[PDB]
């Protein structure tokens, strides 16, 4: 597929990643100093820490589960696959370890967060921002998809990771199932065919996506739908098991008129159609007029993004 093939930069960033990677060992706890905390989520806390020996940056999981040496073992094992993972838009992997306790996951550091945490500082992030965070998204899904047959299936703002170099990656794509059963995350942005038990496929990740893109293009969760004295207030309280019954029972979210094009808007639309027949798939949407557009589109990502979040 032409849509792994990688340029110039990124194939030199990524040999550059493999060449750091190599000389680096097995990771081992008392190596580590801690920086400062990146955030919590997907059964974890994650820190930037510094491996002291090697000197590098990296970003470390911390997964406490009190488990018999054989578990950890088979967790570490299955977590092996990610050295595999190579890509532009997926975070890059160092090592998992056990210890006291805690299962370790070392991945490369993206200084710009995820993107909900880029939403609540920003309020709302642009639909030509938007337009790039969708080719990441798609590419990563289908490099993960046709590379190692894996689907990501957790998709939303939290699970997707920004950097001052403009770059977009996805992350806590689950690869172990030994670490998914042990360890035993929102519901909210899950399919209403994965919420109503019917078998999960790629066209969940890509409503995922969707529901994603419409929540940091008007700034807030899309469900309950916004009434019109908010969308004033924006332009111009359920609980959990009511919402997930609000997915699978009513019509699916969409952006507002007027202020969104409508190539971005019929994009997310064929994301969030309820039966993931009729629902785009990647290679579709890899061709849709909102993204063949924002792919000619040369937007500042990384301009954009640094003094959104002021990281000068
Ligand atoms: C592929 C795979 C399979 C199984 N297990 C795991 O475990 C992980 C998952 C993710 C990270 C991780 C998180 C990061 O921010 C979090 C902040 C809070 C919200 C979270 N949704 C994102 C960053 C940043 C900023 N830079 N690099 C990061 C790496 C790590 Cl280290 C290990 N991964
Ligand atoms: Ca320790
Ligand atoms: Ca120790
Ligand atoms: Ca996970």
Same mark, same amino acid.
């Given at each position: 597929?032409?849509?792994?093939?990688?340029?110039?930069?990124?194939?030199?960033?990524?040999?550059?990643?493999?060449?750091?990677?190599?000389?680096?060992?097995?990771?081992?706890?008392?190596?580590?100093?801690?920086?400062?905390?990146?955030?919590?989520?997907?059964?974890?806390?994650?820190?930037?820490?510094?491996?002291?020996?090697?000197?590098?940056?990296?970003?470390?999981?911390?997964?406490?589960?009190?488990?018999?040496?054989?578990?950890?073992?088979?967790?570490?094992?299955?977590?092996?696959?990610?050295?595999?993972?190579?890509?532009?838009?997926?975070?890059?992997?160092?090592?998992?370890?056990? %210890?006291? =306790? *805690? !299962?370790?996951? $070392?991945?490369?550091?993206?200084? /710009?967060?995820?993107? #909900?945490?880029?939403?609540?500082?920003?309020?709302?992030?642009?639909?030509?921002?938007?337009?790039?965070?969708?080719?990441?998204?798609?590419?990563?899904?289908?490099?993960?998809?046709?590379?190692?047959?894996?689907?990501?299936?957790?998709?939303?703002?939290?699970?997707?990771?920004?950097? %001052?170099? =403009? *770059? !977009?990656?996805? $992350?806590?794509?689950?690869?172990? /199932?030994?670490?998914? #059963?042990?360890?035993?995350?929102?519901?909210?942005?899950?399919?209403?065919?994965?919420?109503?038990?019917?078998?999960?496929?790629?066209?969940?990740?890509?409503?995922?996506?969707?529901?994603?893109?419409?929540?940091?293009?008007?700034?807030?969760?899309?469900?309950?739908?916004?009434?019109?004295?908010?969308? *004033?207030?924006?332009?111009?309280?359920?609980?959990?098991?009511?919402?997930?019954?609000?997915?699978?029972?009513?019509?699916?979210?969409?952006?507002?008129?007027?202020?969104?094009?409508?190539?971005?808007?019929?994009?997310?639309?064929?994301?969030?159609?309820?039966?993931?027949?009729?629902?785009?798939?990647?290679?579709?949407?890899?061709?849709?007029?909102?993204?063949?557009?924002?792919?000619? *589109?040369?937007?500042?990502?990384?301009?954009?993004?640094?003094?959104?979040?002021?990281?000068?």
């Amino acid at each position: 597929l032409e849509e792994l093939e990688l340029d110039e930069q990124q194939r030199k960033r990524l040999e550059a990643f493999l060449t750091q990677k190599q000389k680096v060992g097995e990771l081992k706890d008392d190596d580590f100093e801690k920086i400062s905390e990146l955030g919590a989520g997907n059964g974890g806390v994650v820190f930037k820490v510094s491996h002291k020996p090697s000197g590098l940056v990296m970003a470390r999981k911390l997964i406490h589960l009190e488990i018999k040496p054989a578990i950890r073992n088979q967790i570490i094992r299955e977590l092996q696959v990610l050295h595999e993972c190579n890509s532009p838009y997926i975070v890059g992997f160092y090592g998992a370890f056990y %210890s006291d =306790g *805690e !299962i370790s996951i $070392c991945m490369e550091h993206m200084d /710009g967060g995820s993107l #909900d945490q880029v939403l609540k500082k920003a309020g709302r992030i642009p639909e030509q921002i938007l337009g790039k965070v969708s080719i990441a998204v798609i590419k990563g899904l289908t490099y993960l998809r046709e590379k190692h047959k894996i689907m990501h299936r957790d998709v939303k703002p939290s699970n997707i990771l920004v950097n %001052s170099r =403009g *770059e !977009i990656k996805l $992350c806590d794509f689950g690869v172990s /199932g030994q670490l998914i #059963d042990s360890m035993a995350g929102t519901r909210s942005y899950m399919s209403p065919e994965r919420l109503q038990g019917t078998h999960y496929s790629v066209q969940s990740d890509i409503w995922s996506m969707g529901l994603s893109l419409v929540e940091m293009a008007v700034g807030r969760y899309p469900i309950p739908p916004p009434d019109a004295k908010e969308l *004033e207030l924006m332009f111009g309280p359920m609980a959990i098991f009511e919402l997930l019954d609000y997915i699978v029972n009513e019509p699916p979210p969409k952006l507002p008129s007027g202020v969104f094009s409508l190539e971005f808007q019929d994009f997310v639309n064929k994301c969030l159609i309820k039966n993931p027949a009729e629902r785009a798939d990647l290679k579709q949407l890899m061709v849709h007029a909102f993204i063949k557009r924002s792919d000619a *589109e040369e937007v500042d990502f990384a301009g954009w993004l640094c003094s959104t979040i002021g990281l000068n």
